[PDB]
Amino acid sequence: MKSIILIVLDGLGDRPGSDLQNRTPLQAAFRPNLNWLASHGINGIMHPISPDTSHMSLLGYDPKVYYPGRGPFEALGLGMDIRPGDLAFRANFATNRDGVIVDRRAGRENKGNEELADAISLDMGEYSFRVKSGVEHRAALVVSGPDLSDMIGDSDPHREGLPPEKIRPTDPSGDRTAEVMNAYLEEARRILSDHRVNKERVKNGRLPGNELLVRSAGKVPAIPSFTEKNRMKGACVVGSPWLKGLCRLLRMDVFDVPGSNYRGKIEKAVDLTSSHDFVLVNIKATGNYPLKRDVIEDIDRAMEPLKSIGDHAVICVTGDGDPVPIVFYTDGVMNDGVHLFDELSSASGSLRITSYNVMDILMQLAG
Structure with a gap:
């Protein structure tokens, strides 16, 4: 032919x-x-x-x-890889001051965000987590591993003045995923708050990206x-x-x-x-x-x-x-x-x- x-x-x-x-x-x-x-x-x-x-x-x-969902699309838009069965979110580098989000965008700061993104790309048991940085505060997180569900809520509280939310399952298929996600966002806080990039921003009066707000979980279908x-x-x-x-x-x-x-x-x-x-x-x-x-x-x-x-x-x-x-x-x-x-x-x-x-x-x- x-x-x-x-x-x-x-x-x-x-x-x-x-x-x-x-x-x-x-x-x-x-x-x-x-x-x-x-x-x-x-x-x-x-x-x-x-x-x-x-x-x-x-x-x-x-x-x-x-259609894979808004989440997986952000990943793609950032030249990331996704596979079917992956879980992907829209994400923001944001500022957490004493357990309150004081800025959902870390003031739109961009400098050092790739290094930030890199630092929080890691594995935890059977799960792997990949983040890449976009324009300004924008990122995407792609999660890979077994039995991922997008029946979960956001970590983003959607306005300043609230703590980051704990991921809750929205139906019973989300339970394990929610645990794995909260465990991962805890690790991300700690790495981000302790990172060289954020310590220089605090020292220079720039807003630190010490927290990753996650939003719009989508599972890549087959x-x-x-x-x-x-x-x-x-x-x-x-x-x-x-x-x-x-x-x-x-x-x-x-x-x-x-x-x-x-x-x-x-x-x-x-x-x-x-x-x-x-x-x-x-x-x-x-x-x-x-x-x-x-x-x-x-x-x-x-x-x-x-x-x-x-x-x-x-x-x-x-x-x-x-x-x-x-x-x-x-x-x-x-x-x-x-x-x-x-x-x-x-x-x-x-x-x-x-x-x-x-x-x-x-x-x-x-x-």
Whole structure:
């Protein structure tokens, strides 16, 4: 069968703008390449997602079923690893003065937070705890080990003036997890209060991050790898740390092309059709309207090789009010009569689908 290449133009569809003579960036852009694919392809409007959730959907995973939770998402967003069965929380470095949280953010201080995060990444019996630091006070904690439950409360008391809460089970499956968590947050206090980083902050009158407030426990549910789920060997040409993470969660190989450099991404994706069956490419179009038009034109330019590989590949271009244009091109296909790729032209295409349909239509063409 043929290789598949899915290209997601992040941001895309826009609303008609006066500065482009009542046209969206997309309509205004010179895009012969995207237009070529429409002309020689099937076209339509994709409606994403019924009543984060999007790229997963395109990859064949129903979010209502496979979404890991806010917790695990923070972890991913911080270039962390998660596995199914992991417990993950949103976290804050905060200030605990005499058993009261006097600042849920440790004053937004950031300096030394990675070393803090490092110091409290440890093991305790069958459990391991991993923390990485984000912007300002932000962190994520991922816990691994046996029989973890997200039927537990927050440690965060959600306002200043209260002590950190003891984690309570919210239903009977949470009991053991709550014990393991309180034991771990006790250890974290002590390490943090005694850390070199916090002693210098106190000495310099900066707020110490002597406590880790934990919030939004989510257990990563069972997620089939990309191969298991789709019977394909897949890859991601992506830059977003959360997207890199998602792809790692799914055991797709990940490629971070240094760079604009739309070219290299399309060029790398093309080269991967030799090794893999499926390549997701994510492109950021992210400023005013002439500019947005201009980046779309830059993106079209980058897209030239795609005209030549339909003999051995299926190409898909889509974006991510609400609905978005979509094109499928492969060398055998019967154009449905639309000739332009835009929010209006593509609305005359044969396809009226959701992101959930994409993988099916991609497996069908391809053979």
